[PDB]
Amino acid sequence: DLPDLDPECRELLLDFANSSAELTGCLVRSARPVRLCQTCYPLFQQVVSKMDNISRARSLLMADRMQIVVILSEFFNTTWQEANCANCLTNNSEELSNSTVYFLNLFNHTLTCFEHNCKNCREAYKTLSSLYSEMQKMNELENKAEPGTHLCIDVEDAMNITRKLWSRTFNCSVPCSDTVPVIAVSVFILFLPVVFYLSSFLH
Amino acid sequence: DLPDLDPECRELLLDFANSSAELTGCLVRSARPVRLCQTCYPLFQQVVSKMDNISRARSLLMADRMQIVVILSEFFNTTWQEANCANCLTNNSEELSNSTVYFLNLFNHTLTCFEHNCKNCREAYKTLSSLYSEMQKMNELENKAEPGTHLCIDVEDAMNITRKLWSRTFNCSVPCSDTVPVIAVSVFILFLPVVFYLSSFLH
Amino acid sequence: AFRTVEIKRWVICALIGILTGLVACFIDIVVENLAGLKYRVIKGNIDKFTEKGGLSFSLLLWATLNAAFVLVGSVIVAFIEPVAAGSGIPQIKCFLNGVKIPHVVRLKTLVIKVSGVILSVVGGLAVGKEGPMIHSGSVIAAGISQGREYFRRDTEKRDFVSAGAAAGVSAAFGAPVGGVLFSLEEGASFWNQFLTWRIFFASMISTFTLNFVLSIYHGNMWDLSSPGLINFGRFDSEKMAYTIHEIPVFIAMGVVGGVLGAVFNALNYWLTMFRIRYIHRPCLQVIEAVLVAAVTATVAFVLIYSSRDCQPLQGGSMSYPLQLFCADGEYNSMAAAFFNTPEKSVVSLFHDPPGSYNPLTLGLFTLVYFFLACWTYGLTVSAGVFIPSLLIGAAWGRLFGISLSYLTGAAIWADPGKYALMGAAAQLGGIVRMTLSLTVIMMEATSNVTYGFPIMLVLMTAKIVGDVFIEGLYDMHIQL
Amino acid sequence: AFRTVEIKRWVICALIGILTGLVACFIDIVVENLAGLKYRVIKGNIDKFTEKGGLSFSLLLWATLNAAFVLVGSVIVAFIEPVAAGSGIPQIKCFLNGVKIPHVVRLKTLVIKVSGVILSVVGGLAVGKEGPMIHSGSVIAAGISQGREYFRRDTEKRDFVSAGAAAGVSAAFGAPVGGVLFSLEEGASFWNQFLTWRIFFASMISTFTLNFVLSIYHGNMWDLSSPGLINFGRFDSEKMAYTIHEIPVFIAMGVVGGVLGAVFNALNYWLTMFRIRYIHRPCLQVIEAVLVAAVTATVAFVLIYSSRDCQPLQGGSMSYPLQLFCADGEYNSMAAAFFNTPEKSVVSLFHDPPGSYNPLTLGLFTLVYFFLACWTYGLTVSAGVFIPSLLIGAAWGRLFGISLSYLTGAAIWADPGKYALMGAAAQLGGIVRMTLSLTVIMMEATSNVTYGFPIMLVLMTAKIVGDVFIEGLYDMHIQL
Numbered sequence A, B: 001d002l003p004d005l006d007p008e009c010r011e012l013l014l015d016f017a018n019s020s021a022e023l024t025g026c027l028v029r030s031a032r033p034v035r036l037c038q039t040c041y042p043l044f045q046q047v048v049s050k051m052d053n054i055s056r057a058r059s060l061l062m063a064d065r066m067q068i069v070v071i072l073s074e075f076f077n078t079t080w081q082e083a084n085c086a087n088c089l090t091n092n093s094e095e096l097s098n099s100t101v102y103f104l105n106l107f108n109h110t111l112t113c114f115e116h117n118c119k120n121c122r123e124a125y126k127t128l129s130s131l132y133s134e135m136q137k138m139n140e141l142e143n144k145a146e147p148g149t150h151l152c153i154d155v156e157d158a159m160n161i162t163r164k165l166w167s168r169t170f171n172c173s174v175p176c177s178d179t180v181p182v183i184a185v186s187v188f189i190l191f192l193p194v195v196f197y198l199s200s201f202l203h
Numbered sequence C, D: 001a002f003r004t005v006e007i008k009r010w011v012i013c014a015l016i017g018i019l020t021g022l023v024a025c026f027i028d029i030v031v032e033n034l035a036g037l038k039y040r041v042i043k044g045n046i047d048k049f050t051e052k053g054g055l056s057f058s059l060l061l062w063a064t065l066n067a068a069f070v071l072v073g074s075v076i077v078a079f080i081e082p083v084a085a086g087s088g089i090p091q092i093k094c095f096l097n098g099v100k101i102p103h104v105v106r107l108k109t110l111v112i113k114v115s116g117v118i119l120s121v122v123g124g125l126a127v128g129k130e131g132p133m134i135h136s137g138s139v140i141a142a143g144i145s146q147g148r149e150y151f152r153r154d155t156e157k158r159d160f161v162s163a164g165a166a167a168g169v170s171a172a173f174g175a176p177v178g179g180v181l182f183s184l185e186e187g188a189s190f191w192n193q194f195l196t197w198r199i200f201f202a203s204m205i206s207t208f209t210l211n212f213v214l215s216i217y218h219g220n221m222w223d224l225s226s227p228g229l230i231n232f233g234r235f236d237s238e239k240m241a242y243t244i245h246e247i248p249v250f251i252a253m254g255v256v257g258g259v260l261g262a263v264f265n266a267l268n269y270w271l272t273m274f275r276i277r278y279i280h281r282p283c284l285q286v287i288e289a290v291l292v293a294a295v296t297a298t299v300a301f302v303l304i305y306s307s308r309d310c311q312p313l314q315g316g317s318m319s320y321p322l323q324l325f326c327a328d329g330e331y332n333s334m335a336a337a338f339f340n341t342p343e344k345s346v347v348s349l350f351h352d353p354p355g356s357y358n359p360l361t362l363g364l365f366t367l368v369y370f371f372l373a374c375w376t377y378g379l380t381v382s383a384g385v386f387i388p389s390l391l392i393g394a395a396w397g398r399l400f401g402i403s404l405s406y407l408t409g410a411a412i413w414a415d416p417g418k419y420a421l422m423g424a425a426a427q428l429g430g431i432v433r434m435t436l437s438l439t440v441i442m443m444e445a446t447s448n449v450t451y452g453f454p455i456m457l458v459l460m461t462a463k464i465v466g467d468v469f470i471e472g473l474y475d476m477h478i479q480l
């Protein structure tokens, strides 16, 4: 009974292997234009349900040194938690988290307005940045954490792409042009101890 | 140019995704009756060659926070090094390491001799255990390491299965039956200080 | 007989430990809330005027907030209780060595020094708040053994104020045994074994009192994860290793720390004799503190405004980050050095992974903070000189670490965090020159023993190379 | 004038540090090779006789190998140089306190003690080899300042033998500052500041000498990763935390250590007065050492033979593993406690993750090793009592940790490694009762400062609860 397997446990392992191969496929299909928590949430629920299906059996997890099923499931959980995909789903799962579908709609809106050939479509971008900061503050009072905690990765990379277009490529930031009041006030306040120390020296 | 991808880089990512999905499939097809370094060495060379193909490009690795391609490649390397599959290949790769094909042939020989329905096929098992200890000592002079370093995982799980059959199931170890010389010598040597301390007390 | 006398002594040492811990957590809580309020006002005012012009009103708001807080602090100090100025460590050191400067025996001095150090760290000066914690513990211990008995004796009073100074050091740096050896380096007229246990009892009970009240101020009552007002802990990564490649490097860094400590002491000596000669009326002292707070605010704002290094926010590197002229989503980096408290910029310099600091930004911050701390020290405010010295040393120690990481091929042994530690110990031993008490304190606060021998070498080298030029700071201010 | 005298003193302290380091690495190298040879002979002989009967010849081979090595060691000790027996720490402690026992001023005593401690750890007795390292350093330092000058003076000789004893402690435990405070607890007739620097100079140069020669014996000359003959290092995981849940637990464990230390001292007191009364001729002493080596060999073999806990080999838990009656591929577990050197069974007890030790196997090993070390200590061999005490304490401390892990629901704070550390400190303070030097040594060797206060509490509790019954071991053997 030892070197071979129970046929239902073999079928259970085959089911997990098929589901996990599909998930690794989904994770790398959507690799650089990041849609990791957008296109692979149902496959992730599929994989974690098959892993829960195995441990209701005993031979699959802890009967070898590597525990290749367990370290694969742990790798998918580490990729899930590092991505923080729970913000791209509602608290009851398998939905798309109504805070974020508005953001993806505005992100698509902003890029389609960027497709119009300079600085014309700005208030869409300002609405996007205000929405992103609003979701960042939302991600510290509902889920309590440190300042600057990481949002859901496709949201965060959408905002990454928008800011890299807006600053590094389009070169539009409307600079300050208020240096000379700052330099006037600064040379005044730095000249104030010269006046004080010389006047106290001469008295 | 930012939110979409270069079409050849898209094709490169698609190739890596196909190859890595096949590898995760191979790792879990061969999960419990462990043949990890026996059936997935060419797929591993395939995946590491596509990962080397990407980094000859720049957008695929370090242009997002997660670096899902890089952490996937690092996971396959960690699974490779923990398995120690380099002992199941020759030093020039893509072969089957002539030390170990003899072991797998004898392992199959030993199990086919176990299929003959008590203690009859023993010298095959003793040859197997002598061969396993010989490969363990071979894995400390050619590849210098600590005593009891881990061998290649399908070899080590084959020997695991054989020893669990031979001891926990068949219950055959031909016990010592030499207790009474040990207990005679032990009560003699423990009675020796009683003689010494009493004789020195009475003198 | 004598047993009730020794129980009276030990219960008095327990009370001065508990009271010094309560004073330490009072300082930390009020400074944290008030500096949070002030920096939130300024960060909320810079971001309003970042676009659409302006931004000179932000500089005036920063300068006048600094000026208002230090105006309150110096009218309190320079008018009412003039000996409350400075850290008071020279006065306590000569109190233990025997000579009694007046107006240390009053509770008014405790109130003025605690209120002054609250209003000076908040005030934006280059001030550490664990300088005068030793003097506050000393006057608590002296005030316990007085009226408004056989404890008014000068043999009994000196031992109690020794225990109070040890409790001040332990509540300051998180160092119980460091507080013991600080109290024994001065006034070591005997090795009374029961006195050292009294000192250690008050010291350990002060650190545990500060743990308990600061953790109940935080979430968990059961945590106790803040042993002192500064806690640059956890040096037990692979960056803990000191190696035979680095012992002459540490001796050379001690030489540089001793040289720069001599420069600090000499410039402050000429400055303080100018202040004895001319700026000696109380009204002139108040005006001078107002201008130096306004100047450190405006030179911080000129350095922030004229900087181009922009790095994105890693999770806790920036307390109140502002993007001045950087792109969206990237925050300013020089503004992380003047908006962080000096007790957190030191920890960041000890712990950030390499390549996280610009050499130009850190060099400019080092040079300006060196001259600012040298100017701000000899003032009529309640002000330490520890964390200014420790931040100067951590900053140029990190510059040394970046230089060693560039000269070698980014070697494992040339980690800038460890060299920031050794630089901080070098400058604190170059400016102050206490030999063994910093070795025990910088072992205790980092929770590492393998930094015992190289820090001890660095402190000896800094002390020797420093004493061939000019005396230490805490000994110079008994010689005016 | 006096400057050349102080250079003579410092160069003499440098030589005694270097020579004590060379003697320490000589002991470690010869013990490692000879015990490797002896245990490879026995493991090669048990595996031959495991099947096909026999296995009583293995017991005779073990007993006669132990008997032969200790017969050589005791004919060397009990016939030639009778004061070389024991650890010699009571003789050095009373040497520093003033009284001069004869035959410590000879190089013959150094040769007999070094050869005896080589032939006793190899001989299989319950002996630690860093007991007599202090006496070996002491006689090296005394022999440097003699003939076959103004250093034969008793003021100059006592200070040099103080430096030699400190170098012995530092080469033993890897503790430079621990060696300093060991030398200052005895003969503290003054606080000569230049004497303490001389002591620390010899101490640190002895530890660095042992690093250099042991690392060139190993692969890397540049490594220096063996500060002493015992190095149970790296307590900086999440198992470093001591918490408010555990301070009364540590006080109770100190009580248990003090009680068991009183039991150890009392049983050894009755045993050693029996040895003064009757077994006092040298030939009877040699025969008694031969029988006690044969008995510890055969009770180790009875405990190995009659054990059923079998665990597979994790990568370095077993030095010379033998499968006696276990299945193939699983090795014996009780044989990991009698075949490991006692300097490695302590490290394993400090560092193995929880659930790696049977309570029945460890309890049987604890009980037998307690009575074996108590019997073996008062003998005519060159023998410490440190690592016997430290292994007894680590073993019952780990049993306490397993009990606390069972009573609570396998809590994070009830890690058996930390309680093994506190048990080892408890028993070493119950049997020996040195107060502060073990606090500094057990801080230094573990490289953790947060184990300063709880180890200090445990040592005080063990000393007090121990002294209400019977005096300490090193003080009892000046009173016969």
Ligand SMILES: *[C@@H]1O[C@H](CO)[C@@H](O[C@@H]2O[C@H](CO)[C@@H](O[C@@H]3O[C@H](CO)[C@@H](O)[C@H](O)[C@@H]3O)[C@H](O)[C@H]2NC(C)=O)[C@H](O)[C@H]1NC(C)=O
Residues within 6 Å of the ligand: A062, A063, A064, A065, A066, A067, B156, B157, B160
């Ligand atoms: C030979 O086969 C046996 C199967 O009986 C293997 O024993 C099992 O090995 C795994 C791997 O260490 C053990 O899993 C462990 O589980 C605990 C939680 O229970 C976890 O904390 C550990 O980190 C690890 O995952 C398992 O307990 C152990 N025993 C059983 C009964 O399953 C053995 O490893 C095989 N030997 C080799 C060389 O492959």
Ligand SMILES: *[C@@H]1O[C@H](CO)[C@@H](O[C@@H]2O[C@H](CO)[C@@H](O[C@@H]3O[C@H](CO)[C@@H](O)[C@H](O)[C@@H]3O)[C@H](O)[C@H]2NC(C)=O)[C@H](O)[C@H]1NC(C)=O
Residues within 6 Å of the ligand: A156, A157, A160, B062, B063, B064, B065, B066, B067
């Ligand atoms: C926004 O987009 C930029 C792309 O320009 C992202 O910057 C890149 O982020 C990665 C992740 O930290 C950096 O990779 C790092 O590489 C070094 C070795 O060079 C390695 O030691 C680190 O552990 C990490 O893997 C990369 O340097 C960085 N910059 C560039 C030019 O690629 C940025 O992370 C994006 N922001 C967010 C919030 O996604």
Ligand SMILES: *[C@@H]1O[C@H](CO)[C@@H](O)[C@H](O)[C@H]1NC(C)=O
Residues within 6 Å of the ligand: A049, A050, A053
């Ligand atoms: C396995 O999972 C599927 C879907 O998650 C479920 O329908 C099925 O009942 C599970 N198997 C068992 C035996 O519960």
Ligand SMILES: *[C@@H]1O[C@H](CO)[C@@H](O)[C@H](O)[C@H]1NC(C)=O
Residues within 6 Å of the ligand: A048, A051, A052, A073, A074, A077, A078, A081
């Ligand atoms: C994976 O899912 C959750 C999320 O990390 C985790 O708590 C759970 O234990 C994991 N399941 C496994 C490893 O089977």
Ligand SMILES: *[C@@H]1O[C@H](CO)[C@@H](O)[C@H](O)[C@H]1NC(C)=O
Residues within 6 Å of the ligand: A108, A111, A112
């Ligand atoms: C925007 O969304 C629509 C439907 O939601 C989709 O058809 C379109 O491709 C999106 N735009 C881009 C640029 O992807």
Ligand SMILES: *[C@@H]1O[C@H](CO)[C@@H](O)[C@H](O)[C@H]1NC(C)=O
Residues within 6 Å of the ligand: B049, B050, B053
């Ligand atoms: C990608 O890999 C394949 C096989 O490893 C190889 O034939 C091909 O040349 C590689 N691509 C490039 C651009 O080198």
Ligand SMILES: *[C@@H]1O[C@H](CO)[C@@H](O)[C@H](O)[C@H]1NC(C)=O
Residues within 6 Å of the ligand: B048, B051, B052, B073, B074, B077, B078, B081
């Ligand atoms: C994977 O292959 C080797 C083996 O670990 C490793 O050295 C290499 O850096 C890895 N390649 C990656 C992560 O691209």
Ligand SMILES: *[C@@H]1O[C@H](CO)[C@@H](O)[C@H](O)[C@H]1NC(C)=O
Residues within 6 Å of the ligand: B108, B111, B112
């Ligand atoms: C033994 O090997 C042969 C060919 O190598 C194979 O056909 C057979 O199935 C193997 N036996 C077992 C039990 O797998």
